[PDB]
């Protein structure tokens, strides 16, 4: 016999998903006295990479040295790919540098090894070095560096690689089209991603999934759903990767009935038992204001891993069911499910929204000694929110300084929001400037500080803050409220008159306002950000978008039915008070999801405890 027979059988096993059989063959060849050649080693090393077995891979490296093939280009490229897929990028790089000759396959193995393992900068650096030497990149090369740009968020870089793909005539390769959509979406230019998606002559389910995900991640949930319907019209079958993004779009919109329709499709198509689909269903029901249906999904799941537990814990957290989240955190450990840093963000968030100060401190301090997990900046952010709700503003600011991280806008905004609740003008002042230094084009610090000054009677400084905001050309996005009625999502802006039942909506607000007034409600116009007469301020206040949505819900659903409102920005203090009164008057539960919290208004009381 000869090595050519063995190579044929090893090639067969290695390319049919039987790496262990290929390696078992390689061992037999060794005993039989037939020596491998430069064609055997890539297949056996690829088998090692398929199993993520560094030990055997290192043994084969030893055989490559002894056999005198330390200079063969294909063997060395196979060594690179083996070390990379085994999580040893330094060993792979060492092999790449010592090579006496490299072809394009060797560069792709090293570049892709970096991109697939997070080191996006070194991947692009390697790619720049590759182009100076004049080595033509293949379509796989471009897919790797496009994924590196997507990770880094550098849009201008991806635009460059896009031109390079146009130059190399790869723009019609299906994989390249998918990689470009993914890059543009994650870099923020969703229109250019759609431009690529429409131009593709051939689209797979991966192509549709990338376009749908991009829309869903950039908040554009309606276009995601429209493309998901279009995808069914063209005959492209969604799979277990498509559905989470579709569910995420439903989650953002808060359309509970649209979510249940996608849930039934999930059941029809047999994807319900998929673990990411189930976690997405939990999140979707939670985000749609139905903690009961999220719990039903969780309870009937045949398989519950860490992301399923995290999703259900996070679901209870954002609804302020703090004790239930912690009960689940305990139950999850008793069932042998190890927490992650995501679990701790959720249970610390649960302690925040429910005011469990002592519980939050103990969990946070227990992260490093009692688990393997060192706190990240979001865990410190949760703690700053916890201290803020407790009125311990000094502790919270000191924690921001004493933090072993760079303070970000989230952590300062948390403190700034806490300053508004507790009337801490000077600390609010400091927190605002810190936010402006980090993000000068954000409107939230200006509006917040103006509110601070106004509540404290400092009308002059409040006006100068608003004046400075207009000067710097910074504008806040208009408010917006959505409500699902009869399987349709109705949108309202402040003072809306475009709805076909405007007459009945405004008439219902008139009737309702008479009952609120008789119950003690007194409009507070102090923070109507409009330089107009008092009587005009009260008229604007009457028709803030969440009260239009509540009124539409009241005339469109039978009495006693819960109402579920989604607000894009924030529920102003007067609408929060107003909705407390309304919930008792109409005998309904009213659920408002604003940017930060879930407000459950029940019998004159809100679940947030008047801190948001």
Q: Which of 29, 351, 575, 586 binds Zn ion (CB under 5 A)?
A: 575
Residue 235 phi, psi dihedral angles, 5° rounding: 90, 10
Residue 567 binds Zn ion, judged by CB under 5 A = no
Q: What's the closest the beta carbon of residue 606 comes to Zn ion, in angstroms?
A: 3
- Whether residue 261 contacts residue 247, with contact meaning beta carbons closer than 8 Å, is answered with no
Binding segment for Zn ion (CB under 5 A), chosen from 94-102, 195-203, 241-249, 572-580, is 572-580
- Whether residue 601 contacts residue 592, with contact meaning beta carbons closer than 8 Å, is answered with yes
Distance (Å, whole) CA 380 – CA 396: 10
Give Cα separations from 50 to 16, 18, 27, 287, 483 (angstroms). 12, 9, 17, 39, 50
Complete edge-to-edge strand list for the sheet that includes strand 488-492: 488-492, 481-485, 563-567, 590-593, 598-602, 605-606
Question: In terms of Cα–Cα distance, which of 152, 94, 143, 86 is closest to 118?
Answer: 152
* 58-62 long-range Cβ contacts below 8 angstroms, 24+ apart: 60/26
Q: What's the helix, strand, coil split of the chain in %, to 5? A: 65, 5, 30
Nearer to Zn ion, 203 or 321 (CB): 321
Q: What's the closest the beta carbon of residue 123 comes to Zn ion, in angstroms?
A: 46
Q: Which residues contact 457 (CB under 8 A, 6 or more apart)?
A: none
Q: What's the closest the beta carbon of residue 526 comes to Zn ion, in angstroms?
A: 12
Nearer to Zn ion, 60 or 575 (CB): 575
Nearer to Zn ion, 210 or 572 (CB): 572
- For residue 606, what is the enclosing H or E element? strand 605-606
Nearer to Zn ion, 319 or 599 (CB): 599
Distance (Å, whole) CA 442 – CA 436: 7
Nearer to Zn ion, 434 or 544 (CB): 544
Binding segment for Zn ion (CB under 5 A), chosen from 110-118, 315-323, 394-402, 596-604, is 596-604
Q: What's the closest the beta carbon of residue 518 comes to Zn ion, in angstroms?
A: 21
Q: What's the closest the beta carbon of residue 579 comes to Zn ion, in angstroms?
A: 8
Q: Which of 93, 389, 434, 599 binds Zn ion (CB under 5 A)?
A: 599
Whether the CA torsion 357, 363, 368, 369 is positive or negative: it is positive
Per-residue x/- mask for Zn ion, residues 179 to 198, rule CB under 5 A?
A: --------------------
Nearer to Zn ion, 588 or 599 (CB): 599
Of 540-559, binders to Zn ion (CB under 5 A) are 544
Nearer to Zn ion, 157 or 575 (CB): 575
Q: What's the closest the beta carbon of residue 48 comes to Zn ion, in angstroms?
A: 57
Binding segment for Zn ion (CB under 5 A), chosen from 252-260, 342-350, 444-452, 565-573, is 565-573
Q: Which two tokens stand for residue 554?
A: 């009241």
311-337: string of b/e by CB count within 10 Å (b at 16+)?
bbbbbbbbbbbbebbbebbeebeeeeb
Outline where DSSP puts E strands in 460-571.
481-485, 488-492, 563-567
Of 212-241, binders to Zn ion (CB under 5 A) are none
Nearer to Zn ion, 63 or 422 (CB): 422
Q: What's the closest the beta carbon of residue 219 comes to Zn ion, in angstroms?
A: 22
Of 485-544, binders to Zn ion (CB under 5 A) are 544
Nearer to Zn ion, 263 or 597 (CB): 597
Pairing of strands 590-593, 481-485: unpaired
Nearer to Zn ion, 149 or 572 (CB): 572
* 193-199 long-range Cβ contacts below 8 angstroms, 24+ apart: 199/171
Q: What's the closest the beta carbon of residue 612 comes to Zn ion, in angstroms?
A: 5
Binding segment for Zn ion (CB under 5 A), chosen from 212-220, 240-248, 561-569, 595-603, is 595-603
Outline where DSSP puts E strands in 158-315.
none
Q: What's the closest the beta carbon of residue 574 comes to Zn ion, in angstroms?
A: 5
Residue 608 binds Zn ion, judged by CB under 5 A = yes
Binding segment for Zn ion (CB under 5 A), chosen from 333-341, 460-468, 483-491, 568-576, is 568-576
Q: What's the closest the beta carbon of residue 508 comes to Zn ion, in angstroms?
A: 17
List alpha helices for 86-154, DSSP H. Answer: 89-97, 104-116, 120-132, 139-152
Nearer to Zn ion, 252 or 577 (CB): 577
Residue 286 binds Zn ion, judged by CB under 5 A = no
**Three-state SS at 419:** helix
- Whether residue 571 contacts residue 579, with contact meaning beta carbons closer than 8 Å, is answered with yes
Binding segment for Zn ion (CB under 5 A), chosen from 35-43, 277-285, 427-435, 594-602, is 594-602
Nearer to Zn ion, 140 or 543 (CB): 543
**Three-state SS at 320:** coil
Question: In terms of Cα–Cα distance, which of 106, 599, 105 is closest to 318?
Answer: 599
Distance (Å, whole) CA 79 – CA 61: 7
Nearer to Zn ion, 142 or 598 (CB): 598
Q: Which two tokens stand for residue 419?
A: 């300053």
Distance (Å, whole) CA 599 – CA 606: 6
Nearer to Zn ion, 22 or 608 (CB): 608
- Whether residue 149 contacts residue 112, with contact meaning beta carbons closer than 8 Å, is answered with no
Q: Which residues contact 193 (CB under 8 A, 6 or more apart)?
A: 180, 181, 182, 183, 184, 185, 210, 211, 214
Binding residue count for Zn ion, defined by CB under 5 A: 6
Residue 572 binds Zn ion, judged by CB under 5 A = yes
Q: What's the closest the beta carbon of residue 586 comes to Zn ion, in angstroms?
A: 17
Q: What's the closest the beta carbon of residue 347 comes to Zn ion, in angstroms?
A: 21
Chain centroid to Cα 224, Å, comes to 15
Q: What's the closest the beta carbon of residue 576 comes to Zn ion, in angstroms?
A: 6
Nearer to Zn ion, 263 or 547 (CB): 547
Q: What's the closest the beta carbon of residue 598 comes to Zn ion, in angstroms?
A: 8
Q: What's the closest the beta carbon of residue 287 comes to Zn ion, in angstroms?
A: 17
- Whether residue 576 contacts residue 599, with contact meaning beta carbons closer than 8 Å, is answered with yes
Binding segment for Zn ion (CB under 5 A), chosen from 7-15, 155-163, 211-219, 600-608, is 600-608
Q: Which residues contact 611 (CB under 8 A, 6 or more apart)?
A: 389, 421
Q: Could you list the residues that contact Zn ion (CB under 5 A)? A: 544, 572, 575, 599, 606, 608
């Amino acid at each position: 016999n000869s090595v050519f027979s063995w190579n044929s059988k090893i090639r067969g096993y290695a390319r049919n998903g039987q790496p262990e059989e290929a390696l078992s063959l390689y061992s037999q060849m060794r005993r039989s006295g037939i020596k491998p050649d430069n064609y055997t080693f890539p297949f056996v090393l690829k088998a090692c990479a398929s199993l993520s077995s560094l030990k055997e891979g290192k043994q084969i490296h030893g055989h490559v040295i002894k056999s005198g093939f330390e200079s063969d280009v294909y063997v060395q490229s196979a060594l690179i790919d083996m070390y990379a897929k085994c999580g040893e990028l330094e060993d792979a790089r060492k092999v790449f540098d010592e090579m006496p000759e490299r072809n394009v396959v060797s560069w792709n193995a090293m570049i892709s090894g970096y991109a697939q393992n997070g080191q996006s900068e070194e991947a692009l650096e390697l790619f720049r070095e590759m182009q100076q030497e004049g080595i033509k990149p293949s379509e796989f090369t471009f897919c790797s560096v496009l994924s590196a740009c997507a990770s880094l968020g550098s849009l201008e870089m991806g635009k460059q690689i896009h031109g390079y793909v146009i130059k190399s005539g790869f723009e019609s390769i299906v994989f390249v089209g998918n990689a470009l959509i993914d890059m543009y979406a994650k870099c923020g230019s969703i229109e250019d991603a759609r431009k690529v998606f429409d131009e593709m002559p051939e689209r797979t389910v991966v192509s549709w999934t990338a376009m749908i995900s991009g829309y869903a991640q950039n908040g554009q949930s309606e276009e995601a759903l429209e493309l998901f319907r279009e995808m069914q019209r063209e005959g492209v079958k969604p799979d277990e990767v498509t559905l989470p993004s579709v569910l995420s779009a439903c989650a953002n919109l808060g359309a509970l009935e649209q979510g249940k329709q996608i849930h039934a499709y999930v059941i029809k198509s047999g994807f319900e038992s998929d673990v990411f689909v189930g976690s997405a269903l939990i999140d979707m029901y939670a985000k749609c204001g139905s903690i009961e249906d999220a719990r039903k999904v969780f309870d009937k799941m045949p398989e519950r891993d860490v992301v399923s537990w995290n999703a259900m814990i996070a679901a209870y957290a954002q609804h302020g069911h703090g004790k239930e989240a912690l009960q689940l955190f305990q139950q999850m450990q008793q069932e042998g499910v190890k927490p992650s840093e995501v679990t701790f963000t959720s249970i610390l968030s649960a302690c925040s929204h429910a005011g469990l100060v002592d519980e939050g401190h103990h969990y946070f301090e227990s992260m490093s000694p009692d688990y393997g997990i060192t706190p990240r900046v979001e865990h410190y952010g949760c703690m700053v929110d916890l201290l803020g709700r407790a009125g311990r503003l000094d502790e919270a600011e000191d924690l921001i300084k004493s933090m072993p991280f760079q303070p970000n806008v989230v952590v300062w905004g948390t403190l700034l929001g806490a300053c508004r609740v507790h009337g801490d003008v000077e600390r609010g002042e400091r927190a605002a400037e810190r936010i402006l230094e980090l993000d000068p084009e954000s409107a939230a610090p200006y509006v917040l500080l103006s509110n601070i000054y106004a509540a404290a009677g400092r009308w002059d400084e409040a006006a100068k803050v608003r004046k400075l905001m207009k000067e710097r050309g910074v504008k806040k996005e208009p408010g917006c409220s959505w409500i699902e009625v009869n399987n349709k999502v109705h949108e309202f802006v402040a003072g809306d008159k475009s709805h076909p039942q405007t007459k009945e909506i405004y008439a219902e607000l008139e009737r309702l306002s008479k009952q609120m007034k008789e119950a003690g409600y007194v409009p507070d116009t102090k923070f109507v950000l409009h330089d107009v007469e008092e009587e005009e301020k009260e008229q604007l206040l009457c028709y803030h978008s969440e009260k239009l949505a509540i009124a539409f819900g009241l005339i469109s659903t039978p009495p006693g039915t819960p109402l579920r409102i989604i607000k894009n920005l924030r529920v102003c203090g007067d609408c929060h008070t107003a909705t407390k009164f309304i919930s008792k008057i109409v005998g309904r539960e009213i659920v408002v999801r604003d940017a930060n919290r879930f407000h459950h208004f029940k019998d004159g009381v809100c679940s947030c405890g008047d801190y948001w």
